[PDB]
mmCIF file with all atom_site columns, C-alpha atoms and ligand atoms in Angstrom:
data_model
loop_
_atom_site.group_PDB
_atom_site.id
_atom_site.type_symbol
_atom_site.label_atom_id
_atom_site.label_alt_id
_atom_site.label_comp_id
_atom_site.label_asym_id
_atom_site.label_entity_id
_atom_site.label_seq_id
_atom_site.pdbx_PDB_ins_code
_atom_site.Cartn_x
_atom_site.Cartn_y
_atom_site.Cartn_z
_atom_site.occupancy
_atom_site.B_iso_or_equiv
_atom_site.pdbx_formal_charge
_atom_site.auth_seq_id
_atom_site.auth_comp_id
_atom_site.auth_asym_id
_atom_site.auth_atom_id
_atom_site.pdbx_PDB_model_num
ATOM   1   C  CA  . UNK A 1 1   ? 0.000   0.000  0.000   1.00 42.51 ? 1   UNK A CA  1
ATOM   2   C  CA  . UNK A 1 2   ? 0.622   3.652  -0.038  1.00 44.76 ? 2   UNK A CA  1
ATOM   3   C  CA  . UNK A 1 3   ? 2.356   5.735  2.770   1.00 44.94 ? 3   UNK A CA  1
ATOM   4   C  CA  . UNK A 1 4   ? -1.374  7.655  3.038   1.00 44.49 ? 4   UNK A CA  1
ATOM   5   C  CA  . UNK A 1 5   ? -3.009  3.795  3.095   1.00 41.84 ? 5   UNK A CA  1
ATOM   6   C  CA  . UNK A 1 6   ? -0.991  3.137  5.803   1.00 42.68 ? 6   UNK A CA  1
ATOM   7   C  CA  . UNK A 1 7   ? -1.489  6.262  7.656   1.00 39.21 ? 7   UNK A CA  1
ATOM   8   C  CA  . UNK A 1 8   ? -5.138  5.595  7.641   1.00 38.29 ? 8   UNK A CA  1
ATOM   9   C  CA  . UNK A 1 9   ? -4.986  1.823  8.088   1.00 39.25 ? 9   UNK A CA  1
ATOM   10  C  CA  . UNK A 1 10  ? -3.382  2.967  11.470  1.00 36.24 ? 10  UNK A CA  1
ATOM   11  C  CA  . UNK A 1 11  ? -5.847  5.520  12.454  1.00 33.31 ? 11  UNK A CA  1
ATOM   12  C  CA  . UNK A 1 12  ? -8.857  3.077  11.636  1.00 32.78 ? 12  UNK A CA  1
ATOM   13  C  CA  . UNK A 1 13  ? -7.259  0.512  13.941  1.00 28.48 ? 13  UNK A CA  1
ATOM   14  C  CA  . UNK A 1 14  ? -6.291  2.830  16.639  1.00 27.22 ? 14  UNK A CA  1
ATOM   15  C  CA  . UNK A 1 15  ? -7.776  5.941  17.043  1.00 27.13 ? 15  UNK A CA  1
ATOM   16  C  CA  . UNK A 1 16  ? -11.271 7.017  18.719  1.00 25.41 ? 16  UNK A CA  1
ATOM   17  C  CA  . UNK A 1 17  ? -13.750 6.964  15.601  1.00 24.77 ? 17  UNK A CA  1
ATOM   18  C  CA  . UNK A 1 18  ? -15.528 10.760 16.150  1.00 24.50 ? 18  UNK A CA  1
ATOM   19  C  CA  . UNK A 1 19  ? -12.724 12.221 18.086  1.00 20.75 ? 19  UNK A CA  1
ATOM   20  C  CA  . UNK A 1 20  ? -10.581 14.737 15.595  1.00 20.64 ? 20  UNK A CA  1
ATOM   21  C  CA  . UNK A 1 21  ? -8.050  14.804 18.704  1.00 19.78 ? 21  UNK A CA  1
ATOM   22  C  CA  . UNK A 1 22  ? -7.404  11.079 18.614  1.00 18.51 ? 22  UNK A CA  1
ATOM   23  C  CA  . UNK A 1 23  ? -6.590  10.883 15.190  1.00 17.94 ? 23  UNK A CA  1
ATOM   24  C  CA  . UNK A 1 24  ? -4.064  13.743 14.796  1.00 18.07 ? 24  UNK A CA  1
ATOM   25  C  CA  . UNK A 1 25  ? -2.531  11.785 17.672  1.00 18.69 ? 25  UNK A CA  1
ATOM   26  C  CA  . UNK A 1 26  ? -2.654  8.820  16.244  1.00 19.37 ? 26  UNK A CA  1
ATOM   27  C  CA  . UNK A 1 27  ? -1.037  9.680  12.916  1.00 20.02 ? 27  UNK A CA  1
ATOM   28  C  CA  . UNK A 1 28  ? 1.525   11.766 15.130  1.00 16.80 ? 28  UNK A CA  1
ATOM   29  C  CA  . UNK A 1 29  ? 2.135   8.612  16.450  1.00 14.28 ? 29  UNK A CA  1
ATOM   30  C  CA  . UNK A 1 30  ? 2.242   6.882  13.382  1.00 12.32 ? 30  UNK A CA  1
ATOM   31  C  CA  . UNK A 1 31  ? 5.161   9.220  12.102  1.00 11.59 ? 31  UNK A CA  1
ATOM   32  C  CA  . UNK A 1 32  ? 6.584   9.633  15.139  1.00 11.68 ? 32  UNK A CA  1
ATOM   33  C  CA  . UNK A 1 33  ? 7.668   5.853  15.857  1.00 10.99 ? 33  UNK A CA  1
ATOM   34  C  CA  . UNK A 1 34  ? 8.876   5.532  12.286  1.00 11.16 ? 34  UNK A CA  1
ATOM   35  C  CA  . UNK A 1 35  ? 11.042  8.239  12.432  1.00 6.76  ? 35  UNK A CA  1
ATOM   36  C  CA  . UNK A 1 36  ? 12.673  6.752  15.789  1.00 6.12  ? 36  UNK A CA  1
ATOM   37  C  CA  . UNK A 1 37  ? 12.467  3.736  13.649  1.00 6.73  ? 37  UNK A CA  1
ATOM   38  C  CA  . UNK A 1 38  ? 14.903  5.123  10.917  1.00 5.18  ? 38  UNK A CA  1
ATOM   39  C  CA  . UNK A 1 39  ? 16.907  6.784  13.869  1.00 7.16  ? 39  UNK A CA  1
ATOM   40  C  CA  . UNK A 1 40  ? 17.403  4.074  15.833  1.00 5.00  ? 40  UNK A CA  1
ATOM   41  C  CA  . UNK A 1 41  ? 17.806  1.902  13.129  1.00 4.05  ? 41  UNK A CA  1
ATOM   42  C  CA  . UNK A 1 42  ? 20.726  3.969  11.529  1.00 2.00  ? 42  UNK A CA  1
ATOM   43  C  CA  . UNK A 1 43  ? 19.714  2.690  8.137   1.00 2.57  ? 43  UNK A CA  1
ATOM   44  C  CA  . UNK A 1 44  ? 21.110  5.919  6.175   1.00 4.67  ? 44  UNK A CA  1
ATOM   45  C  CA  . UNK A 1 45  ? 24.425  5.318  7.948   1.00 4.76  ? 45  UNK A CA  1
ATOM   46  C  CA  . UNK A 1 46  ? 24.557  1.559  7.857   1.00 2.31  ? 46  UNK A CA  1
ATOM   47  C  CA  . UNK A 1 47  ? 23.758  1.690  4.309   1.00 2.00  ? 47  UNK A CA  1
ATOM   48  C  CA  . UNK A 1 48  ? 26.889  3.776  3.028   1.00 2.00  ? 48  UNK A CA  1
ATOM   49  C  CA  . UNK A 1 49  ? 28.677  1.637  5.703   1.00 2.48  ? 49  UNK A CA  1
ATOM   50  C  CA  . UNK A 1 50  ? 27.421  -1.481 3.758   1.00 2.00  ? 50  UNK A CA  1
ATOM   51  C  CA  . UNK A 1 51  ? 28.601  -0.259 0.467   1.00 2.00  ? 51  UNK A CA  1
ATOM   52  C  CA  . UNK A 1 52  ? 32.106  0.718  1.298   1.00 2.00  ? 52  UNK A CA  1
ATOM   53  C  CA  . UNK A 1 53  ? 32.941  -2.564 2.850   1.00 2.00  ? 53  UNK A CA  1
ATOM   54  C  CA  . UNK A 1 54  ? 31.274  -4.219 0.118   1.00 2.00  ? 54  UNK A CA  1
ATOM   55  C  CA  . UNK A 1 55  ? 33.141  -2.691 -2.700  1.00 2.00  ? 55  UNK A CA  1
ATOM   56  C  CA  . UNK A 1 56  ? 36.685  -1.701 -0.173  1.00 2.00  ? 56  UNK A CA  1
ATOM   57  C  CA  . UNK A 1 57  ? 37.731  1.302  -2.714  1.00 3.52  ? 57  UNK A CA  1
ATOM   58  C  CA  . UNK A 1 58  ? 40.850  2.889  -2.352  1.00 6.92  ? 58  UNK A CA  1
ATOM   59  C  CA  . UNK A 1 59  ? 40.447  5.939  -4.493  1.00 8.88  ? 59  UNK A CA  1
ATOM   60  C  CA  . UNK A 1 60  ? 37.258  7.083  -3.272  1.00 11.09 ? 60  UNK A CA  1
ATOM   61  C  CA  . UNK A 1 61  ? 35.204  10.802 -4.542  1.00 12.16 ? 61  UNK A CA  1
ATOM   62  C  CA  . UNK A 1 62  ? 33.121  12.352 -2.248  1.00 11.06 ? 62  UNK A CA  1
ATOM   63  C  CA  . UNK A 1 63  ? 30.684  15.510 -3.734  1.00 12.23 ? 63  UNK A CA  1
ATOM   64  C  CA  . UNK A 1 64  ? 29.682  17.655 -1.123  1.00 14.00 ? 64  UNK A CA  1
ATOM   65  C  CA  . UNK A 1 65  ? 31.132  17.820 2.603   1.00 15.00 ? 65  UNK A CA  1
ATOM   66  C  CA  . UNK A 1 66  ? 28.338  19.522 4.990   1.00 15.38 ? 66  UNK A CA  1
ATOM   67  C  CA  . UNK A 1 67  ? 30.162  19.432 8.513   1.00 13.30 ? 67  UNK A CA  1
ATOM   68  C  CA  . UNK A 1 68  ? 32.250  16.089 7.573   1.00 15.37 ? 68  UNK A CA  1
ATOM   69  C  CA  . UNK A 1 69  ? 29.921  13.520 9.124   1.00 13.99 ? 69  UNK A CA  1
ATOM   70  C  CA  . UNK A 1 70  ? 30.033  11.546 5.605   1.00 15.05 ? 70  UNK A CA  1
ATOM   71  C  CA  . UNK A 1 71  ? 33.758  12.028 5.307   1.00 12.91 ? 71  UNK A CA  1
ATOM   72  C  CA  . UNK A 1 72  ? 34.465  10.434 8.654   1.00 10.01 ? 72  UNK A CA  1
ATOM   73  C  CA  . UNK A 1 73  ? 31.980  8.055  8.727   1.00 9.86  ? 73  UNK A CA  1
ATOM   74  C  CA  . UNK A 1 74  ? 33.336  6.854  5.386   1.00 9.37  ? 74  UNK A CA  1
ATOM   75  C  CA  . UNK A 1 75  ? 37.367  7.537  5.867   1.00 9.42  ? 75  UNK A CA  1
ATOM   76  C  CA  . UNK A 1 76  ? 36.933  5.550  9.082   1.00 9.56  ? 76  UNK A CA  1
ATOM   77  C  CA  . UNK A 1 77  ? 36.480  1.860  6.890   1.00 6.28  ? 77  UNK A CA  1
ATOM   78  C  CA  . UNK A 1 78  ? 39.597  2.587  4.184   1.00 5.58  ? 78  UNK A CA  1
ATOM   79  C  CA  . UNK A 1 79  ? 42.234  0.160  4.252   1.00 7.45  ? 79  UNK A CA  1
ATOM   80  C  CA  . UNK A 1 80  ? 45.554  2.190  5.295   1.00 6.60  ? 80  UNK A CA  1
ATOM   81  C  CA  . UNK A 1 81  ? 46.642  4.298  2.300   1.00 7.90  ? 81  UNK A CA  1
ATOM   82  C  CA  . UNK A 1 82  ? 43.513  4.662  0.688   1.00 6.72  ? 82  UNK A CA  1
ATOM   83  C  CA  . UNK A 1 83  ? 42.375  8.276  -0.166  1.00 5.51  ? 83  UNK A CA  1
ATOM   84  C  CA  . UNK A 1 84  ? 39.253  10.031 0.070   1.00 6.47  ? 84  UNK A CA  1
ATOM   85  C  CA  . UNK A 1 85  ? 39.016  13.181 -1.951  1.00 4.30  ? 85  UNK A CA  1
ATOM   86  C  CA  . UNK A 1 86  ? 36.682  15.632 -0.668  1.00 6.01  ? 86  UNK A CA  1
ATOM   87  C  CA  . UNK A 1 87  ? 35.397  18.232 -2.950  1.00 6.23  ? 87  UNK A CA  1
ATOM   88  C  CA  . UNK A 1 88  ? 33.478  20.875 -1.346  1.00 4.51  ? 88  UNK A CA  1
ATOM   89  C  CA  . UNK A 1 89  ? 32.212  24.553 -2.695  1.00 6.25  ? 89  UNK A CA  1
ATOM   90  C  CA  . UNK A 1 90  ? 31.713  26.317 0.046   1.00 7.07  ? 90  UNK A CA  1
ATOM   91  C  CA  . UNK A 1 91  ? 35.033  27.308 2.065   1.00 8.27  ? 91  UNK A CA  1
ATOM   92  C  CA  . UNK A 1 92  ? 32.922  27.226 6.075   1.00 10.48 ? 92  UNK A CA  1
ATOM   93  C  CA  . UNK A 1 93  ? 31.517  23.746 5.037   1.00 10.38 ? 93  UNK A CA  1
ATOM   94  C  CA  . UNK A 1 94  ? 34.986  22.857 4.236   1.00 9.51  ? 94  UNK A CA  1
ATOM   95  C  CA  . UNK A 1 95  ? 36.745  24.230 7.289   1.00 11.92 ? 95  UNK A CA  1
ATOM   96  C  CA  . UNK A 1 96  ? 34.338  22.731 9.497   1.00 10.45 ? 96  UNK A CA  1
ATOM   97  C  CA  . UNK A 1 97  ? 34.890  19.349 8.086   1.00 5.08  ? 97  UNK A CA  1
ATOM   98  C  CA  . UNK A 1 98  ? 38.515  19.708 8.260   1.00 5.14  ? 98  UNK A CA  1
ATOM   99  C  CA  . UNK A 1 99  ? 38.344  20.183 11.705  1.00 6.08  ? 99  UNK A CA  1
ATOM   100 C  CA  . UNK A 1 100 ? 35.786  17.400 12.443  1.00 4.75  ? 100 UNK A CA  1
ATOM   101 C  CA  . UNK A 1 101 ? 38.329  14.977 9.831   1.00 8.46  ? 101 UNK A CA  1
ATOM   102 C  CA  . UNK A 1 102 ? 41.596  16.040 12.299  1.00 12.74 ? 102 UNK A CA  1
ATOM   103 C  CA  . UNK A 1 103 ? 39.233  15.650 15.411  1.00 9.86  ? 103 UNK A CA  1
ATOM   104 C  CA  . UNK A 1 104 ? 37.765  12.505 14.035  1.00 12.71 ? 104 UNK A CA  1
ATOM   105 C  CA  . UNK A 1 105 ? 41.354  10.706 13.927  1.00 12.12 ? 105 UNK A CA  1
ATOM   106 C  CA  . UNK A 1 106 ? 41.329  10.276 9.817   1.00 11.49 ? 106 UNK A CA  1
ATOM   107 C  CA  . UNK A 1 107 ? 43.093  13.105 8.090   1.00 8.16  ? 107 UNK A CA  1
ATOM   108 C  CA  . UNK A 1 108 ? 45.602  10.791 7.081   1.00 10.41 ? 108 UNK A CA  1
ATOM   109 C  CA  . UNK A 1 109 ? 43.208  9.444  4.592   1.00 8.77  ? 109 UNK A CA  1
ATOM   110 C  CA  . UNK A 1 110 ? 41.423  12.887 3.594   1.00 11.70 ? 110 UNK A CA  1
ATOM   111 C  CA  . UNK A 1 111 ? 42.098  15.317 0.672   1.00 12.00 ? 111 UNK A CA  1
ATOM   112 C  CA  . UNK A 1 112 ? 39.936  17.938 0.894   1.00 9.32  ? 112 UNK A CA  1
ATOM   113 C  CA  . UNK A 1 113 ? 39.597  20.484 -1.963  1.00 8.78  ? 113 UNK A CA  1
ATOM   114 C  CA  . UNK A 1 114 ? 37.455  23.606 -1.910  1.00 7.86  ? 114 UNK A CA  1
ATOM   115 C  CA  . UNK A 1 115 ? 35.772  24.941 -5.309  1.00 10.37 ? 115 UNK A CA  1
ATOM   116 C  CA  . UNK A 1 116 ? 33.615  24.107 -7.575  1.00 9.67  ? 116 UNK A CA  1
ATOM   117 C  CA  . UNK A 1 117 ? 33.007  20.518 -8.982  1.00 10.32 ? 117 UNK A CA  1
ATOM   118 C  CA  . UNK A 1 118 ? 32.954  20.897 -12.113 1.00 11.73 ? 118 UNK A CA  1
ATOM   119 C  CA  . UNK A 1 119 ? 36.098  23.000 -12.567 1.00 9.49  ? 119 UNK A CA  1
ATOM   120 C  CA  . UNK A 1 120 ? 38.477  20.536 -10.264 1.00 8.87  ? 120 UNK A CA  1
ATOM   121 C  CA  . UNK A 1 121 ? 36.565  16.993 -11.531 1.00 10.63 ? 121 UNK A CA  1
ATOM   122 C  CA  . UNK A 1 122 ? 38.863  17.230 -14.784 1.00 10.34 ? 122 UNK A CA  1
ATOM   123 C  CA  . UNK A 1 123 ? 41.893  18.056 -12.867 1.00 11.06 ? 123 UNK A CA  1
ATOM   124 C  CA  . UNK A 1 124 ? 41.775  15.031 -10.870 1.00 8.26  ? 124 UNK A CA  1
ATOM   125 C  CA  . UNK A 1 125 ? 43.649  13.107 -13.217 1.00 5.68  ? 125 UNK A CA  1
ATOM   126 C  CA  . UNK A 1 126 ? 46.519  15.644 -13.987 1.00 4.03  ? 126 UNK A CA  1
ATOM   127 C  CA  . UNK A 1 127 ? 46.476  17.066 -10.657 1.00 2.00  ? 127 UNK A CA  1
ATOM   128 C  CA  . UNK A 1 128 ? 45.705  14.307 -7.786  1.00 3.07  ? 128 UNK A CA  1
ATOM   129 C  CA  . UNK A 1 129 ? 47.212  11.372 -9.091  1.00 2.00  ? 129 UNK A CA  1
ATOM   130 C  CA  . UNK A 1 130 ? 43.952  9.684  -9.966  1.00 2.00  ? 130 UNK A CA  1
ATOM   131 C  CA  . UNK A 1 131 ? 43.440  6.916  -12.735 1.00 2.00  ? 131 UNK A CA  1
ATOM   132 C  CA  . UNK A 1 132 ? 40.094  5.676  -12.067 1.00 2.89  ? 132 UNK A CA  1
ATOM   133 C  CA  . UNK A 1 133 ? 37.589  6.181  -9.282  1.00 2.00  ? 133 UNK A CA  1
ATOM   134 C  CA  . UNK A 1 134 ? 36.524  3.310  -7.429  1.00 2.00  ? 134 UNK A CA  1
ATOM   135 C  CA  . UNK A 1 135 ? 33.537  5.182  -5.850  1.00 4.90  ? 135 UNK A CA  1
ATOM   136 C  CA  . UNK A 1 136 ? 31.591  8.446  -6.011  1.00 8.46  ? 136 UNK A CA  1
ATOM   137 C  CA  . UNK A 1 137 ? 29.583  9.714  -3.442  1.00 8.53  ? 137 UNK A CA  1
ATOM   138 C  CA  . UNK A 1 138 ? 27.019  12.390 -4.366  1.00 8.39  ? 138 UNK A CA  1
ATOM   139 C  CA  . UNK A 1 139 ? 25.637  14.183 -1.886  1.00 10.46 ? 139 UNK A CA  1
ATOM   140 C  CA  . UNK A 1 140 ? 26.481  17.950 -2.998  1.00 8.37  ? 140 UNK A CA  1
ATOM   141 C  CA  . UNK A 1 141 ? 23.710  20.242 -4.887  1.00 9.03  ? 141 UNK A CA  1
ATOM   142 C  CA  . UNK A 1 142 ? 21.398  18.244 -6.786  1.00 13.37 ? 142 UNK A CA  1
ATOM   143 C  CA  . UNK A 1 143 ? 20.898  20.382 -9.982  1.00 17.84 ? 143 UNK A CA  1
ATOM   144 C  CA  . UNK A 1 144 ? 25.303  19.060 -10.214 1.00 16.18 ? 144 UNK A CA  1
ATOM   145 C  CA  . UNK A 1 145 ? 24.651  15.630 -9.990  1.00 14.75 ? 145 UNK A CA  1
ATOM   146 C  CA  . UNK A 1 146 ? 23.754  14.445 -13.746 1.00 12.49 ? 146 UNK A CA  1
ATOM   147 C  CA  . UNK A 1 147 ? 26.070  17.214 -15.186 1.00 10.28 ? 147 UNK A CA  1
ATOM   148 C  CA  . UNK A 1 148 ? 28.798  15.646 -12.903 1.00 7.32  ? 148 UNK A CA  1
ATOM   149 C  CA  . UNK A 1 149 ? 27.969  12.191 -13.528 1.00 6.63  ? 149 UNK A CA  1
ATOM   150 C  CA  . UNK A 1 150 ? 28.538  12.884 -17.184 1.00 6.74  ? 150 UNK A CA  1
ATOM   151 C  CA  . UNK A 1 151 ? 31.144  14.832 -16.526 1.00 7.95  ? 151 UNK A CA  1
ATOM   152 C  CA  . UNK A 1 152 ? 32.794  11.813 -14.597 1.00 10.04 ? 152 UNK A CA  1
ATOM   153 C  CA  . UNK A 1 153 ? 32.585  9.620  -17.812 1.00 8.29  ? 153 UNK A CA  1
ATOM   154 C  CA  . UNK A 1 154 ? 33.372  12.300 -20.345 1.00 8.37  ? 154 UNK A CA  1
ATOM   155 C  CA  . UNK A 1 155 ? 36.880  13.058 -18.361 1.00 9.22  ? 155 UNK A CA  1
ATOM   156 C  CA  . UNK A 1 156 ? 37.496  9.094  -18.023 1.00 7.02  ? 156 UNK A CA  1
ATOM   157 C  CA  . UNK A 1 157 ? 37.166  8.586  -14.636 1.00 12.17 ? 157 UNK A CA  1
ATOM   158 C  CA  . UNK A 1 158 ? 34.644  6.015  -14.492 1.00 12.63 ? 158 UNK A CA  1
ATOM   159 C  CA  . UNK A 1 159 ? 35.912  2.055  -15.096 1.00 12.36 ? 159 UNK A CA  1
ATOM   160 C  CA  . UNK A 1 160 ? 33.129  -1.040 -15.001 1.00 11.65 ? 160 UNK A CA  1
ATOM   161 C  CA  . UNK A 1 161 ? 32.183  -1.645 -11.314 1.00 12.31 ? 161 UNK A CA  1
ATOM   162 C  CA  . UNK A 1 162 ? 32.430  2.354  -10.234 1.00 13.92 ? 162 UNK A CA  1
ATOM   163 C  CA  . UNK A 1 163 ? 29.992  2.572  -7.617  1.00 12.51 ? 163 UNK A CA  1
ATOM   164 C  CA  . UNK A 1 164 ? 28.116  6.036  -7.403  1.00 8.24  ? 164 UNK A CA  1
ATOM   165 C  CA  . UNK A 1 165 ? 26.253  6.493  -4.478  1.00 6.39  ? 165 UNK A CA  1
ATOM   166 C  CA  . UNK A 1 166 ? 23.557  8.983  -4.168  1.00 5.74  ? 166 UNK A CA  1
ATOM   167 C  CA  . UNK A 1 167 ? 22.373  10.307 -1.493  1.00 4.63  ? 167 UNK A CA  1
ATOM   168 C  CA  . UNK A 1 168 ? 18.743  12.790 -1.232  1.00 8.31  ? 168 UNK A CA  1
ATOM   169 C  CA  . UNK A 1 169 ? 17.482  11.435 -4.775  1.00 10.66 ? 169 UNK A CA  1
ATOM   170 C  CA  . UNK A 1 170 ? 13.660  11.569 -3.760  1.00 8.96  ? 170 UNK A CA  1
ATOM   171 C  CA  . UNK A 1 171 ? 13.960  14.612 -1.333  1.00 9.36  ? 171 UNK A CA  1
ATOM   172 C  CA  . UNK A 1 172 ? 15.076  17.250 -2.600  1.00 7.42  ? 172 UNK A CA  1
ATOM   173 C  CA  . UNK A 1 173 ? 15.459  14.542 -5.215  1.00 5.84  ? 173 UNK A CA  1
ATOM   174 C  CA  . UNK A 1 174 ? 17.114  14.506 -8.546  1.00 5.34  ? 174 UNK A CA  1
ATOM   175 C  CA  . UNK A 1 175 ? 15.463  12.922 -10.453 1.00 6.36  ? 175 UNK A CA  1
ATOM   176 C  CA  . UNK A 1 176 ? 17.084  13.872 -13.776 1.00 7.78  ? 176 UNK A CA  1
ATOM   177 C  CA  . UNK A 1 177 ? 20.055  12.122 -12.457 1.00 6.86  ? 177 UNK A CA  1
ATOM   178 C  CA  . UNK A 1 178 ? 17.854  8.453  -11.386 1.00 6.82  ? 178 UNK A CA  1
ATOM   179 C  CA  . UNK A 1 179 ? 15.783  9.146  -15.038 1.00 5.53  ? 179 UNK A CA  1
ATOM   180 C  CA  . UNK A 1 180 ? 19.702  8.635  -16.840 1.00 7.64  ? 180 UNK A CA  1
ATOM   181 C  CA  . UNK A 1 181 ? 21.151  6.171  -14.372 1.00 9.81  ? 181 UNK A CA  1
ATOM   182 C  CA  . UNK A 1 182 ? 18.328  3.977  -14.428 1.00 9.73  ? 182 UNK A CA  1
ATOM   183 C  CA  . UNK A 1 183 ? 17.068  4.085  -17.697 1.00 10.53 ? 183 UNK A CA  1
ATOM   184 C  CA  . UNK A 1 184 ? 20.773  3.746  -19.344 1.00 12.67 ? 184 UNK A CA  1
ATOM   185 C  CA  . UNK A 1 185 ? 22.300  0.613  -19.740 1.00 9.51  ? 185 UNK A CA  1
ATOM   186 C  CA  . UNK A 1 186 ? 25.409  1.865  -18.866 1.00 9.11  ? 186 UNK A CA  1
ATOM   187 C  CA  . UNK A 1 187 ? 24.229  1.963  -15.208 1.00 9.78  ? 187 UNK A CA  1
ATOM   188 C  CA  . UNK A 1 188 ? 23.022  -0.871 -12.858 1.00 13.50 ? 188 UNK A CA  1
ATOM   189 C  CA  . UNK A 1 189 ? 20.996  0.791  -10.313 1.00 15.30 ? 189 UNK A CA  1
ATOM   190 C  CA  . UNK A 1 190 ? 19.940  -0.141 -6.706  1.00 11.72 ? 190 UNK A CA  1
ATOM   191 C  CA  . UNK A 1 191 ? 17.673  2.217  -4.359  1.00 16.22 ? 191 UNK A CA  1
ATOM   192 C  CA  . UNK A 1 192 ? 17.584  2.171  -0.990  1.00 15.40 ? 192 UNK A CA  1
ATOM   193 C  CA  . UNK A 1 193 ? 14.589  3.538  0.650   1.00 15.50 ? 193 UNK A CA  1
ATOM   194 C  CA  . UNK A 1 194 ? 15.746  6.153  4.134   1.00 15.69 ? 194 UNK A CA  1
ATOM   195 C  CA  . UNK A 1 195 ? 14.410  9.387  6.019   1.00 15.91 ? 195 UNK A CA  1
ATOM   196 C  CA  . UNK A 1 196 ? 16.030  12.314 6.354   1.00 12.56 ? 196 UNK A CA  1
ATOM   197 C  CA  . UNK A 1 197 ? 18.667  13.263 8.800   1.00 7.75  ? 197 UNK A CA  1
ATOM   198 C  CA  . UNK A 1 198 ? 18.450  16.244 10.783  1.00 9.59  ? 198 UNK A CA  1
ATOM   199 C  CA  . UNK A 1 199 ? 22.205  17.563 9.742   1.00 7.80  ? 199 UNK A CA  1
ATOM   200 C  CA  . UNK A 1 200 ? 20.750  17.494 5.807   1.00 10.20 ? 200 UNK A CA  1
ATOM   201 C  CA  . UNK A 1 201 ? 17.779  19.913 5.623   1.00 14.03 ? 201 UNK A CA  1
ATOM   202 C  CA  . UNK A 1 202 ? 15.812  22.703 7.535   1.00 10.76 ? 202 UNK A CA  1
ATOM   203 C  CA  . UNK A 1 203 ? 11.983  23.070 7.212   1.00 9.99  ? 203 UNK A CA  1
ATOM   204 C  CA  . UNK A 1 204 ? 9.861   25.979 8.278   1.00 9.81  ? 204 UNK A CA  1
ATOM   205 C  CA  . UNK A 1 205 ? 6.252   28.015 7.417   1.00 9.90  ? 205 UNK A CA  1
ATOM   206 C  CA  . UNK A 1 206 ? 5.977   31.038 6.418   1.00 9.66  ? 206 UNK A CA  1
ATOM   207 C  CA  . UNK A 1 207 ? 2.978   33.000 7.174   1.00 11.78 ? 207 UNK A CA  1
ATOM   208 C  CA  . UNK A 1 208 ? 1.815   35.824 5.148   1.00 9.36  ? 208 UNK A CA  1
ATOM   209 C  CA  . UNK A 1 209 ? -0.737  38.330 5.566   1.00 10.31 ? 209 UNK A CA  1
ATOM   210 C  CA  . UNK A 1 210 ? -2.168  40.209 2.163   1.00 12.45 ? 210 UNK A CA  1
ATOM   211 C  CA  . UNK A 1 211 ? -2.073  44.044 3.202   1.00 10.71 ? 211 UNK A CA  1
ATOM   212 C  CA  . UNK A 1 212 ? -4.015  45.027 -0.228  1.00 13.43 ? 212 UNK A CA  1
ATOM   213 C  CA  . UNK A 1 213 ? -2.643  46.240 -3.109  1.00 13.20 ? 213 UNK A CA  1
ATOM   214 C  CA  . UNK A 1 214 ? -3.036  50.072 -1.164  1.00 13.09 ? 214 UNK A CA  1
HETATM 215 CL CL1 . CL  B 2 .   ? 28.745  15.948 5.997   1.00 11.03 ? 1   CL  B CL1 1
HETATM 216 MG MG1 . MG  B 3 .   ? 22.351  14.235 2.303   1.00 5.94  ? 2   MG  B MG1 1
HETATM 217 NA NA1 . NA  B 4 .   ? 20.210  1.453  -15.637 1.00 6.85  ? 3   NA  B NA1 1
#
């Protein structure tokens, strides 16, 4: 069934029929137990985990560094001597992370480079001693992750059994990127249903009140 089925399958069978109070309860409930389900249950975490010691790369491309969560949690599982190049835009992101890398105990294994993808991508040959790339993970801005994708292949970086990793494909979402992955046969895909993590997005409302046109 549908998320919404569900939702309602669970108010049916546990809420007060007639009481509005109940339900909104209920359905908090509902949302609130399977979002200490996905906490709890680490599954965004165990599932990069899962990857990297499936595949043990050694020349491994991350996209995107927020406060360096993903860089540690994935530096942590390299083999000694393996590299992890970090490419991150924005210069805060990428001091934070440095200091959460040295803090972490793995800066031995991280190179982290600040600018844009695109521009340093076709350097990484020349520049950082790279041949292929055993694994990419994407978890930068999403309108960059087809462009860089193709840009991967176009500058020869990708061999047979790269694994790309993708994180936030449904929300934001790129779906651009999962439309070409998927649908070309150069690409076996996988997806791996999660929930968000706190550290990844902010929500809010806005409320606004008309004043006329005056
Ligand atoms: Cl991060
Ligand atoms: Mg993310
Ligand atoms: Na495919």
């Amino acid at each position: 069934d549908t998320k919404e089925q569900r939702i309602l399958n669970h108010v049916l069978q546990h809420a007060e029929p007639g009481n509005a109070q109940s339900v909104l309860e209920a359905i908090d409930t509902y949302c609130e137990q399977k979002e200490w389900a996905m906490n709890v249950g680490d599954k965004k975490g165990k599932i990069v985990d899962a990857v990297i010691q499936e595949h043990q790369p050694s020349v491994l491309l991350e996209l995107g560094a927020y406060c360096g969560y993903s860089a540690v949690r994935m530096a942590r599982l390299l083999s000694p001597g393996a590299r992890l190049i970090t490419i991150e835009i924005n210069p805060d992101c990428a001091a934070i992370t440095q200091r959460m890398v040295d803090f972490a105990g793995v800066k031995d294994k991280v190179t982290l480079v600040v600018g844009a993808s695109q521009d340093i991508i076709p350097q990484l040959k020349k520049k950082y001693d790279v041949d292929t790339l055993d694994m990419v993970f994407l978890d930068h801005w999403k309108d960059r992750y087809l462009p860089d994708t193709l840009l991967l292949e176009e500058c020869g970086l990708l061999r047979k059994g790269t694994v790309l990793l993708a994180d936030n494909v449904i929300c934001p979402g790129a779906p651009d990127f999962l439309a070409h992955v998927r649908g070309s046969s150069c690409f076996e895909c996988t997806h791996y249903q999660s929930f968000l993590e706190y550290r990844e997005v902010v929500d809010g409302l806005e409320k606004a009140i008309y004043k006329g046109p005056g």
